[PDB]
Structure 1
């Protein structure tokens, strides 16, 4: 199976999963929108009304397509959709991770000039450590994010749902970043438990903080916001863009094809996998990747790839 789409399934998976691409008529919201041409890039499927087609519904004048993704690891209800993480891709070229140098798949590809790749395990740890060490980067109109681990310019992540990889608890803290930052500069602490989130003012010398008007019954550590513990916090936290240059050089992500049936040269349209044979005696519609004739599986798994 060739998966070009990856989503974050909030439930029941609570992880990054291969996604199924779907389209419907934006007017009647039925799966009857036949595309004049297929999507060739992420903008085609993420930007409203980018693409046009024909609705096959009886009395619907619909022209515009509406794309959405669903987790493919299990049955999903009609409106059980998931957010697409376009920075994540199959590691078909077997690029090594910029941090651990392991060959993993899928990987996250930063938008930096070098297009450094990083495995999801390492990206998870990267986000977790920056979150705990309060080292997220503030962008005025976007919020809080992180650039490439190599600190490359113009690599700041714009689709903030990528930080869902923090895990559900840590992601909740990430959503409180501005508020917690204000409480911290004040010499205070923010209760880590989602249902509470009370602002607390502990003793400046005390490291244990009790959520005690009305708080909750939770004693936690001031430095790692975890349930209070003896001695040192996690070694990854008290350990505070130093990247191995050779590992970073390795970790970089770097037109027609004959019709499978009649072998006439067919032109590819951008990253779209849908190929349409021009030969009037053939006119095969086929997948650039699979070499088979076009079908719903190729549509859902890899309508396009970039």
Structure 2
């Protein structure tokens, strides 16, 4: 039997398998061929992962079936009881999603001298420019607006070393199951569909990579290229396109080239099949021999294999579970003062509490029950 494998490409190479071939054996074939460790490969068929112990027969794979192989090792270990509210994409040295550190400065002088009127309580407070007011303590600075910024929390960072905040990503303290895999994972990405469908980051990576391989990204005139909720919910395209950086450098670079590749294809062009040089080529409309040239092998335009004369070889190239979708919906009192023990109610999302008792006036963290400090401020200034 011949199956087609798409690995970091929109072109699927043929692989010979038998009814008794396991998915693990298929991964071993692709591992040696690509020089990539076998235990890092994931096989995806019609938007679903195929398990190592399943055979080709168990999977119901037929002649000319297209499977995706994506390089992403499964990591079981996670932190379900995490305290952090925020996530950033650290572009150096982590090169991945990490818990973030929230900081504030004066939007005028850029010093950490802005005394906020009140602490932030929501994403809008820290993402929308000039939303929060205060007074700058620096001599003669008329600064009245706060400027928030985030940094990676996994290692020290300079005051200039910012990382982009990932507003869709949240600590899964609600223990909501993933829409695709039904597992309870943390952190999760929350789609902005009406149902606020939840996806784990492992599934989100597989979703994006297979959609890059199938060239199924959606073009929005006032947005660019993006993806909606995996369930196909209306008006759910990701607007904050920096969320695609969480796929890592190799995959984000493929995403960045999507538009230029789509323009070439729209003009009757073709993308080069060779792994490494996947450039948008513009040959002569009726020419079968396509040679790679702007600024490497000569391929047959029909079968996408090395240029041959005569016939091409005979060999040539999703719905979410209803109950899983309903379960994966993100949105479906008083504490004593740590010092004077007088109970107080938290009015909003801000974790910075201040005891109203005149002899006490202790500033404390609602979550930790400790005196307010820079660590609590950076890690969980407000609830998300």
| Structure 1 and Structure 2 fold alike (TM over 0.5) | yes
1-structure distance, mates of 2:300, 2:163: 34
The structure having more radius of gyration, on CA atoms, is: 2
Deviates more, 1:140-149 or 1:83-92: 140-149
Inter-CA distance 156–265: structure 2 relative to 1 (3 Å threshold): farther
For residue 263 of structure 1, what is the aligned residue in structure 2?
341
Inter-CA distance 46–233: structure 2 relative to 1 (3 Å threshold): farther
Inter-CA distance 16–220: structure 2 relative to 1 (3 Å threshold): farther
Write the mapping of 1:58-73 to structure 2, written as runs, cut at 5 A: 58-73=139-154
1-structure distance, mates of 2:355, 2:312: 62
Inter-CA distance 24–118: structure 2 relative to 1 (3 Å threshold): same
Inter-CA distance 124–29: structure 2 relative to 1 (3 Å threshold): same
2-structure distance, mates of 1:200, 1:141: 27
* Partner-residue secondary structure (3-state), 1:176: helix
1-structure distance, mates of 2:313, 2:190: 28
Contact 2:102–2:149, Cα closer than 8 Å, also in 1: yes
5+ residue gaps, structure 1, are: none
Shift of 1:161: 0.7
Instruction: State the superposition RMSD in angstroms.
Output: 4.5
Deviates more, 1:250-259 or 1:121-130: 250-259
1-structure distance, mates of 2:142, 2:303: 56
Shift of 1:265: 3.9
1-structure distance, mates of 2:122, 2:313: 41
Shift of 1:150: 1.1
Contact 2:113–2:136, Cα closer than 8 Å, also in 1: yes
Shift of 1:264: 3.4
**TM-score after normalising by structure 2:** 0.67
**TM-score after normalising by structure 1:** 0.83
Contact 1:129–1:236, Cα closer than 8 Å, also in 2: no
Deviations along 1:45-70, one digit per CA (max 9) or x if unpaired, are 11111111232323423221111111
Contact 2:98–2:153, Cα closer than 8 Å, also in 1: yes
* Partner-residue secondary structure (3-state), 1:127: helix
* Partner-residue secondary structure (3-state), 1:270: coil
Deviates more, 1:104-113 or 1:122-131: 104-113
Structure with the larger RCO, 1 or 2 (CA within 8 Å, 6+ apart):
1
Deviates more, 1:118-127 or 1:28-37: 28-37
Contact 2:261–2:279, Cα closer than 8 Å, also in 1: no
Deviations along 1:63-93, one digit per CA (max 9) or x if unpaired, are 2111111112222233221110011111122
Deviates more, 1:64-73 or 1:184-193: 184-193
Write the mapping of 1:114-129 to structure 2, written as runs, cut at 5 A: 114-129=195-210
Inter-CA distance 250–19: structure 2 relative to 1 (3 Å threshold): same
Shift of 1:36: 1.8
Contact 1:133–1:237, Cα closer than 8 Å, also in 2: no
Contact 1:20–1:72, Cα closer than 8 Å, also in 2: yes
Deviates more, 1:269-278 or 1:258-267: 258-267
1-structure distance, mates of 2:313, 2:93: 28
5+ residue gaps, structure 2, are: 1-83
* Partner-residue secondary structure (3-state), 1:34: strand
Inter-CA distance 227–262: structure 2 relative to 1 (3 Å threshold): farther
* Partner-residue secondary structure (3-state), 2:371: coil
* Partner-residue secondary structure (3-state), 1:75: coil
